[PDB]
RNA sequence: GCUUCCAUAGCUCAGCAGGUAGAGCAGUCAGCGGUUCGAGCCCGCUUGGAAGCUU
């Protein structure tokens, strides 16, 4: 589980910060790539990094901002001509539907693949085995959401070598037990799976905030995330321009990630405003509320490790 | 440059939901790391081959 920013600018495109965008790695938790909003050049940004258009199997838009979404059709087209197959889920807020098939129709593009696009609301928005995303209404004025991608915890380790000397040689039941199925071994000997089971491992939590403004939502939400990605774009000092813009400053995420008790905080979405240099100054005006705080550049990669 | 299939006893390609290597002849399963109880098979990356590259 790894974090790769493709985009971490606000608004306009910048020579130091394109447009957001940011990628979830799950290639070793299900051998896929899952997109955080698609803002203009996207496909660009990948160009330059290990991902590949049909490693994308879900793309989650937090509001319908341009910066935001107009990545989307130039990425899905793309898919399409490098021979996709597997199947992708766009999940956005009303509105996103008609901008997929209006800029899909238009350039008559037809895909090699099957096409989802999921119109959103508050509460979970995809559940399986393995994962479980919830979205929650944010501050922003235009209708605007906040993801969490919460992994559901995996099964313990299993005692092996108490099974190897319980004279069980290793073969196909060993994924049996692993489940904790009771099974009926080859010389008739009955044995509980859950009893050679170590405890589940905790699974990880990554929080994509998108656009908006202080939120006690999005607190409620990051609540003991592994990784909490905030935008923070403007500075301590310009508290009444977040106000008015419907935004949050480096202080701002620093609160909400301290408050919601998370591990990690990354501020994304930064002003083009602030240069490299002052990119620093950003990032310490949250250490200061929060220590383990990173102010996100392009093609940073952060890694989700597990407990 | 990109994206997709090939590299296994000096040499023909056999292999399976991942269960501890099956043959013709005078086994560092290309390297390394990871996932896993376990990797030839799954995920990375680094090497050597082949084929596409119109929104
Ligand atoms: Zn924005
Ligand atoms: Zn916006």
Redesign the pocket.
């Given at each position: 589980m790894e974090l790769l920013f493709l985009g971490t600018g606000a608004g306009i495109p910048a020579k130091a910060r394109n447009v957001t965008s940011v990628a979830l790695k799950l290639?070793?938790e299900r051998?896929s790539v899952w997109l955080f909003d698609c803002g203009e050049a996207t496909?660009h940004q990948?160009?330059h990094?290990?991902?590949?258009?049909?490693?994308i199997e879900k793309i989650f838009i937090t509001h319908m901002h341009g910066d935001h979404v107009y990545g989307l059709?130039?990425?899905?087209?793309?898919?399409?001509?490098?021979?996709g197959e597997d199947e992708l889920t766009v999940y956005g807020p009303k509105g996103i539907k008609a901008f997929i098939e209006t800029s899909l129709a238009v350039?008559?593009?037809h895909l090699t693949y099957p096409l989802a696009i999921q119109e959103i609301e508050e509460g979970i928005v995809f559940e399986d085995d393995q994962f479980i995303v919830t979205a929650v209404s944010v501050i922003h004025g235009v209708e605007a959401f906040g993801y969490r991608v919460q992994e559901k915890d995996?099964?313990?380790?299993?005692?092996?070598?108490v099974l190897?000397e319980m004279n069980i040689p290793?073969?196909?039941?060993?994924?049996?037990?692993?489940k904790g199925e009771t099974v009926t071994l080859e010389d008739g000997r009955i044995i509980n799976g859950n009893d050679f089971?170590?405890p589940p491992?905790k699974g990880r939590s990554v929080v994509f905030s998108g656009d908006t403004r202080v939120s006690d939502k999005l607190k409620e939400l990051a609540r003991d995330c592994d990784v909490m990605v905030h935008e923070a774009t403007f500075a301590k000092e310009d508290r009444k321009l977040a106000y008015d813009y419907y935004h949050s400053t480096t202080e701002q995420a620093a609160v909400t990630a301290k408050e919601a008790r998370a591990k990690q905080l990354i501020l994304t979405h930064i002003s083009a405003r602030y240069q490299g240099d002052a990119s620093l100054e950003l990032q310490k005006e949250a250490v200061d509320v929060f220590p383990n705080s990173v102010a996100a550049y392009d093609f940073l990669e952060v890694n989700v490790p597990?407990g």
């Open positions: 290639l070793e051998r496909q990948m160009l990094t290990t991902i590949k258009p049909r490693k059709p130039g990425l899905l087209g793309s898919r399409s001509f490098q021979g350039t008559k593009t995996v099964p313990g380790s299993l005692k092996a070598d190897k290793p073969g196909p039941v060993y994924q049996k037990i692993k089971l170590e491992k597990r």
